Design a protein around this ligand. Sequence first.
Ligand SMILES: CCCCCCCCCCC(=O)OC[C@H]1O[C@H](O[C@@H]2[C@H](O)[C@@H](O)[C@H](O)[C@@H](O[C@H]3O[C@H](CO[C@H]4O[C@H](CO[C@H]5O[C@H](CO)[C@@H](O)[C@H](O)[C@@H]5O[C@H]5O[C@H](CO)[C@@H](O)[C@H](O)[C@@H]5O)[C@@H](O)[C@H](O)[C@@H]4O)[C@@H](O)[C@H](O)[C@@H]3O)[C@@H]2OP(=O)(O)OC[C@@H](COC(=O)CCCCCCCC[C@H](C)CC)OC(=O)CCCCCCCCCC)[C@@H](O)[C@@H](O)[C@@H]1O
Ligand SMILES: CCCCCCCCCCCCCCCC(=O)OC[C@H]1O[C@H](O[C@@H]2[C@H](O)[C@@H](O)[C@H](O)[C@@H](O[C@H]3O[C@H](CO)[C@@H](O)[C@H](O)[C@@H]3O)[C@@H]2OP(=O)(O)OC[C@@H](COC(=O)CCCCCCCC[C@H](C)CCCCCCCC)OC(=O)CCCCCCCCCCCCCCC)[C@@H](O)[C@@H](O)[C@@H]1O
Ligand SMILES: CCCCCCCCCCCCCCCC(=O)OC[C@H]1O[C@H](O[C@@H]2[C@H](O)[C@@H](O)[C@H](O)[C@@H](O[C@H]3O[C@H](CO)[C@@H](O)[C@H](O)[C@@H]3O)[C@@H]2OP(=O)(O)OC[C@@H](COC(=O)CCCCCCCC[C@H](C)CCCCCCCC)OC(=O)CCCCCCCCCCCCCCC)[C@@H](O)[C@@H](O)[C@@H]1O
Ligand SMILES: CC(C)=CCC/C(C)=C/CC/C(C)=C/CC/C(C)=C/CC/C(C)=C/CC/C(C)=C/CC/C(C)=C/CC/C(C)=C/CC/C(C)=C/CC1=C(C)C(=O)c2ccccc2C1=O
Ligand SMILES: CC(C)=CCC/C(C)=C/CC/C(C)=C/CC/C(C)=C/CC/C(C)=C\CC/C(C)=C/CC/C(C)=C/CC/C(C)=C/CC/C(C)=C/CC1=C(C)C(=O)c2ccccc2C1=O
Ligand code: HEC
Ligand code: HEC
Ligand code: FES
Ligand SMILES: [Ca+2]
Ligand SMILES: [Cu+2]
Ligand SMILES: [Cu+2]
Lengths: 139, 299, 223, 152, 149, 73, 56, 115
Amino acid sequence: MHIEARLFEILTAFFALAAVVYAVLTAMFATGGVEWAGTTALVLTTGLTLITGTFFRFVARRLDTRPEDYEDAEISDGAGELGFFAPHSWWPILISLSFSTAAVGAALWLPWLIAAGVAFVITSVCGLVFEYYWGPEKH
Amino acid sequence: WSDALALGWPTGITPEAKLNRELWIGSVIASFAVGAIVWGLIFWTSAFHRKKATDTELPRQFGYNMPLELTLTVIPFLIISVLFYFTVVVQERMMHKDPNPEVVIDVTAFQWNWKFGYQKIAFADGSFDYDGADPERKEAMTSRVGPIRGMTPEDRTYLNFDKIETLGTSSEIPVLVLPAGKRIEFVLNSADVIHGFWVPEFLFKRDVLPEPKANNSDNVFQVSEIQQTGAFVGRCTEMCGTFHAMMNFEVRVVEPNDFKAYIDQRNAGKTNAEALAAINQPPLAITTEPFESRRGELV
Amino acid sequence: QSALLRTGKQLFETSCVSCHGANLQGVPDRGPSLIGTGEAAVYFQVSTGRMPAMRGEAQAPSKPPHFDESQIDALGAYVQANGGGPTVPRDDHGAVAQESLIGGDVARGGDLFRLNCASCHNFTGKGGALSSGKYAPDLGDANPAQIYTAMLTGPQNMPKFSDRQLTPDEKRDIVAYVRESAETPSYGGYGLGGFGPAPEGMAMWIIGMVAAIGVAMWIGSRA
Amino acid sequence: MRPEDIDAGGMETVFPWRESDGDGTTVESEHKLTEIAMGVRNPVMLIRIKPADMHRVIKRKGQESFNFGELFAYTKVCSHLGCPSSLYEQQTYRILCPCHQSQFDALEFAKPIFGPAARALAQLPITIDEDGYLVANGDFVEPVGPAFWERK
Amino acid sequence: CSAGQISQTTTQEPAVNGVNAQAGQVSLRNVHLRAPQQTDYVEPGTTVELLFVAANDSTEGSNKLKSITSDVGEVTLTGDSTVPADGVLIVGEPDGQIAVTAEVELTKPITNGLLYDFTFTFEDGETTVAVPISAGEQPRRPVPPAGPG
Amino acid sequence: VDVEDVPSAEWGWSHMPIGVMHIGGLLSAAFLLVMMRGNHVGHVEDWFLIGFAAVIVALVGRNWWLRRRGWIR
Amino acid sequence: ETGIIKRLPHGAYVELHQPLGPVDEHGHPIPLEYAGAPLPKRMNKLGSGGAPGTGS
Amino acid sequence: ALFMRTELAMPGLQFLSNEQFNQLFTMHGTVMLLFYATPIVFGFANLVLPLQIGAPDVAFPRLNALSFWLFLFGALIAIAGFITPGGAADFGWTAYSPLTDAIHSPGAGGDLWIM
Ligand SMILES: CCCCCCCCCCC(=O)OC[C@H]1O[C@H](O[C@@H]2[C@H](O)[C@@H](O)[C@H](O)[C@@H](O[C@H]3O[C@H](CO[C@H]4O[C@H](CO[C@H]5O[C@H](CO)[C@@H](O)[C@H](O)[C@@H]5O[C@H]5O[C@H](CO)[C@@H](O)[C@H](O)[C@@H]5O)[C@@H](O)[C@H](O)[C@@H]4O)[C@@H](O)[C@H](O)[C@@H]3O)[C@@H]2OP(=O)(O)OC[C@@H](COC(=O)CCCCCCCC[C@H](C)CC)OC(=O)CCCCCCCCCC)[C@@H](O)[C@@H](O)[C@@H]1O
Ligand SMILES: CCCCCCCCCCCCCCCC(=O)OC[C@H]1O[C@H](O[C@@H]2[C@H](O)[C@@H](O)[C@H](O)[C@@H](O[C@H]3O[C@H](CO)[C@@H](O)[C@H](O)[C@@H]3O)[C@@H]2OP(=O)(O)OC[C@@H](COC(=O)CCCCCCCC[C@H](C)CCCCCCCC)OC(=O)CCCCCCCCCCCCCCC)[C@@H](O)[C@@H](O)[C@@H]1O
Ligand SMILES: CCCCCCCCCCCCCCCC(=O)OC[C@H]1O[C@H](O[C@@H]2[C@H](O)[C@@H](O)[C@H](O)[C@@H](O[C@H]3O[C@H](CO)[C@@H](O)[C@H](O)[C@@H]3O)[C@@H]2OP(=O)(O)OC[C@@H](COC(=O)CCCCCCCC[C@H](C)CCCCCCCC)OC(=O)CCCCCCCCCCCCCCC)[C@@H](O)[C@@H](O)[C@@H]1O
Ligand SMILES: CC(C)=CCC/C(C)=C/CC/C(C)=C/CC/C(C)=C/CC/C(C)=C/CC/C(C)=C/CC/C(C)=C/CC/C(C)=C/CC/C(C)=C/CC1=C(C)C(=O)c2ccccc2C1=O
Ligand SMILES: CC(C)=CCC/C(C)=C/CC/C(C)=C/CC/C(C)=C/CC/C(C)=C\CC/C(C)=C/CC/C(C)=C/CC/C(C)=C/CC/C(C)=C/CC1=C(C)C(=O)c2ccccc2C1=O
Ligand code: HEC
Ligand code: HEC
Ligand code: FES
Ligand SMILES: [Ca+2]
Ligand SMILES: [Cu+2]
Ligand SMILES: [Cu+2]
């Protein structure tokens, strides 16, 4: 996955150059000195690509050429099990309802409704995480 | 024709406005030339490259022209570079501020109207000197520990006040009187929210901000002169609330002698309406009229 | 003090002329007249943060105050100088009276609150809903002076309680019940908002029945 | 109570009191005053319509002279089910019942305009005596409270 | 819906004991009569005070108040009744005011709670206000203690 | 109904006559319209009742026409 | 549905299914008849998850 | 936008107030940039992107479904400010400060818009 990491490094270099140039260009020319709200975002924008880019670099150097990373790869090269993909689940709609309940409580500033929403979110998230791991009932 | 290529821009009443309009016409000409070429290319291939009803074989499968791609990348870079230079040249002239202005205007914006004050008048020829600074009422807002650098959000010391002030009313459009052919300094200070000081004939506007110094905003702009007399309307351009659309104002331009006379009645306690009538001018705004209080025709 | 009147008009010119006019006559269909309202009305409306308003609706709701205590006094004096009206009570030092307005007989205040105040609000003063869009706000954040001025002035839809209909002693006793009932902790546990059966049933269904059903599925079996 | 004791836009519950009832210091007087407080049909709302809004007042037939100028007296008992309807809004002149949200237009003789109420609140005629105290100008012309099969 | 053209905060009138009136171009605010009372009627011959504030809507010219008449007696105006261009004309001194006054000599009995017609003319209007009787910051008058019954 | 429409057709009550739902729909709109006879002075609620009644009537008519023409069964 | 996606050598994407009863000639099972009882839909409920291990 | 466009046809407020018009473009912009334009970017992406790269599904099928419901309930909350008596947000989709402040925007419509 050499190309995947190269995309983020290209963005990392431009974001780093823009953050450094704009900081040094506002410290001596913008009224009031460095533009802080504005610079902080640019500096940490580089970090977003830096974290993803660095991780992709480390991952690429560990694994060899994948079937999708091979210029001339055959379809039969990728035969086998891919992994686990959830066939169906009604938990995600419950999580959204739980999160929306807390948001309405936060919007109207209802401490009881916020607490219920937080408890609903934890309960709904627990169901999503444990959906494919609950064992058979022991009776 | 400059009247059609301006796309509705006013002619302008200040040298900065005239320069800004010149840049607008040239940029529009450049934009139309580029647009015509692209539209012509799109129309040419849409009328002459249509599937002929006798062409069996599929067309040549070409998708890479390296000499062409480089050529059509440098050319757009050259056009923007040329425009950028003129952009920098014009904006430097428009934002230039003379260290010794002759008329200083305090523009105060609130919800939802305008207040105009004469901070200082000092004509270049020395025929009229005036000092409208009123320090006995600006420091009455001191409020002090304080949540922000020792002061409450209701500090309001950034606001400026003057002895002669034109206060807007829901039933009276505020009128700002300025001399013709004289440099005018505008100081913009809001009270609660952001407003917009826009005069379409000025071909320039700046947002009125509360606490501009704390926000690192240059709330002061100047015009070299006003080249003609008359009445010009001004509107609030930044959204500020319920009556954002019903807080317009008018700028009145008179001769320097008429402007000097008008200040005399204002100093003599006369209101804005009667002072304007004393210099043979309409007492109320003529470009704009106060909006009806009736929330609508169904009220 | 001429400085106080001039300062108040200076705030009025930049904050209130849009809906009340320059001479306090009121802009039709935008705002009523402030002549005769008095200092008490301005003090309450500004300290509670209600004014300046921002749009026309069923009720302008409460919000953080736009002016500090010094500016409220100047604003109230300017309006008081035009038409007179009721004035906010003050202590010996000349500040706004807060502690001295607490009555010593809460039992009388409770009955008075139930007769005259607990109709729009509830018993514990949590609030209530009015005809269409309008609603009575919570009384747990109002200081005694704000309650006194609200009784004196009669905000948007609130029958004005004059000093003759409700004497200052009765008003002092009424705010004593309001201030006491706000900070008395609930004796049977969590207050559940102090609204009555409506939160009790909701809490029941979401706690007792959820626990009872959840326990049942633990003890019981599926299929 | 005197007419000047209430400002414009105000509301205050009044009760039927007589000289023979007494001040309640004695045992007999207190018992007499108990039924006044415990009277189901006793409470009456006394509202003072603003003089600027007096031109919008619509009088009911047989009750045109039931007001003492800008002072109006309406029963506090809701005509629907008997709850005290004392949520009087001074500007909208709307009397709201907190039990089942019935709204009455105080300007239009307390005519119901919302909720399950279908009959207007009874109006009590009022006047002043020689001493300037507000007194009743007779009895209600219609029964007070919830309707029944034998009403009207 | 409640924020439409018909609002409940824009149609709201003043929460005072006065009357808002429009005499063509001059706005009358807080129009009320001050009259202490002891008996059910204020007997004729008792001097009362009529208080209001006149606001000039127009900001160009001035106006002057003349010939205030009513069917309650004779109204006497003392002082400079000229209202400035964009100012106020406060007549009388209401309670809570730390000099134009209107003096009324009653010819017929009046009482609190009723409406009495008044005529206001400045130069271009004849309007009726129906001025009521309003009590200011005066305390509640004592009531005699009832007997045992 | 049969198995392909309701798989558990023989395991319980799975069929409701279309006449009941069509008549109930007309009565649903009739009840919405008659409620305009009240003490309310406003007409915003009246238009909401009219719109809902019209929507219900349109749905009932659409279903009846489709059932009559044989497009749906 | 086990939720496991397997790519066939010719590129077909199929999901591994766990039959609830007997199977016909090839992989596909013979359809069972509904008996009014709940039918498992999660492979973890059938014991495919195993046990974490005896201990504290 | 049609209500706004039909109001800006003739000078004067025929059927809309200033507050209603202010709520109109705020909600119009919010709905038509964030509730229509942004989701349909992932609307087409959930359609063909797994097909384009020859994939059988998305990386996180459960998380993909969570995004739809979270978005749908989030969009409904902001629109739900209209049913409030004060109205929905009336300060514009750029929600400039301090207009969006409690002092200048005290209604619950703006609060529901934020959440
Ligand atoms: C089958 C059912 C289907 C429906 C059809 C069948 C029924 C339709 C047929 C009729 C029917 O409904 O009957 C059943 C009912 O019967 C009895 O009701 C009758 C009548 O109807 C009532 O309206 C009436 O109000 C009752 O008088 C009482 O008020 C009178 C006054 O009021 C008049 O004024 C009112 C308001 O104004 C005035 O207000 C105040 C009054 O002083 C003052 O402030 C003031 O004066 C004011 O006036 C002003 O006026 C002018 C202004 O302009 C000016 O002058 C001035 O300014 C002044 O100020 C209005 O609001 C009223 O409407 C009315 O007009 C007083 O005069 C009385 O003294 C008393 O207090 C009266 O009672 P009575 O005479 O006592 O008895 C008679 C007898 C009933 O006869 C029957 O036919 C019975 C047979 C038929 C019914 C079924 C039973 C038989 C079937 C078998 C048993 C089954 C096996 O009794 C009984 O046997 C009843 C027994 C119990 C029932 C058993 C059922 C079975 C049990 C098991 C189920 C009561 O018992 C009710 O409870 C009962 O429901
Ligand atoms: C097996 C199951 C069986 C057991 C289950 C039972 C558990 C019960 C849980 C709670 C138990 C608490 C016991 C102690 C009670 C106590 O001693 O309490 C003190 C005081 O505290 C509150 O005073 C607040 C301030 O202190 C005052 O200063 C302030 O004035 C006051 O304000 C009111 O008064 C003002 C005027 O004065 C008004 O202006 C204002 O408006 C208002 O009215 C305030 O009160 P208020 O806002 O009510 O709540 C504020 C609450 C914030 O909410 C809440 O806790 C909400 C959460 C619980 C409430 C009940 C559930 C309701 C359900 C939802 C409604 C669901 C709805 C969703 C809809 C979905 C579907 C619909 C379609 O903060 C807190 O307490 C913080 C504490 C947090 C505790 C968290 C619990 C810990 C659980 C951990 C478990 C671990 C176990 C693991 C084992 C292995 C008031 O109560 C006072 O009366 C009371 O006196
Ligand atoms: C395609 C689907 C749907 C299409 C709909 C989309 C477009 C609809 C357009 C509607 C117009 C909206 C205008 C908005 C702005 C507005 O509102 O400004 C009007 C003013 O009006 C009121 O003043 C009136 C006067 O102007 C004042 O002069 C006067 O004083 C005042 O009088 C009161 O006050 C006085 C004191 O002053 C009292 O004395 C007096 O007694 C009284 O009380 C007046 O009030 P009043 O008569 O109440 O009328 C209020 C409004 C009323 O608004 C409204 O549209 C309310 C909302 C109605 C919308 C319908 C709901 C839709 C149904 C569901 C969604 C179904 C779901 C679908 C199912 C699933 C899908 C499967 C198919 O009238 C109108 O706008 C005109 C009505 C025309 C609307 C037509 C729509 C009907 C539905 C048709 C459906 C057909 C479907 C068939 C399909 C085959 C006051 O409010 C003012 O402030 C306010 O300013
Ligand atoms: C199942 C049923 C009702 C069948 C009846 C069929 C029939 C013969 C109908 C004809 C008769 C008619 C016309 C009936 C109309 C209905 C009616 C008016 C009924 C009157 C009394 C009656 C029979 C009531 C039945 C109520 C009932 C069966 C409720 C079921 C609710 C269940 C199963 C809940 C458990 C699930 C659960 C743990 C959910 C979480 C908790 C929550 C949020 C529950 C919802 C909830 C509820 C249910 C409240 O009651 C409530 C009250 C006050 C405040 C809040 C809540 C609240 O949030
Ligand atoms: C018949 C009738 C009265 C209905 C009309 C009113 C109506 C439309 C109801 C809903 C009101 C709402 C939710 C308005 C706010 C705007 C909004 C976000 C609504 C729609 C949004 C939407 C369509 C989707 C967003 C996502 C979604 C669907 C979830 C919403 C989550 C929420 C918060 C729903 C609950 C709404 C609701 C009506 C429940 C109230 C629960 C009750 C009765 C509790 C009463 C109660 C009170 C009052 C306390 O004070 C209290 C204090 C301390 C502890 C407990 C309580 C307590 O339980
Ligand atoms: C319905 C007619 C009410 C009656 C009866 C009482 N109050 Fe009220 N109250 C009502 C409204 C509509 C409002 C808000 C008006 C507005 O313009 O916002 C209020 C407000 C108050 C407050 C202010 C609380 C705060 O802002 O934090 C207080 C302190 C208050 N009201 C007190 C009060 C008392 C003491 C009452 C009995 C004499 C009483 N209210 C009755 C509506 C109504
Ligand atoms: C338009 C947005 C307004 C601004 C600007 C100011 N006020 Fe106001 N006010 C407005 C309305 C629509 C009303 C009546 C109903 C209501 O919302 O309160 C008022 C009323 C008052 C009152 C009470 C009047 C009474 O009779 O009790 C007072 C004391 C008041 N207004 C004062 C006030 C002040 C001090 C302002 C500047 C901060 C101000 N108003 C601005 C609408 C508007
Ligand atoms: S009891 Fe008064 S409304 Fe039903
Ligand atoms: Ca229009
Ligand atoms: Cu503005
Ligand atoms: Cu604006």
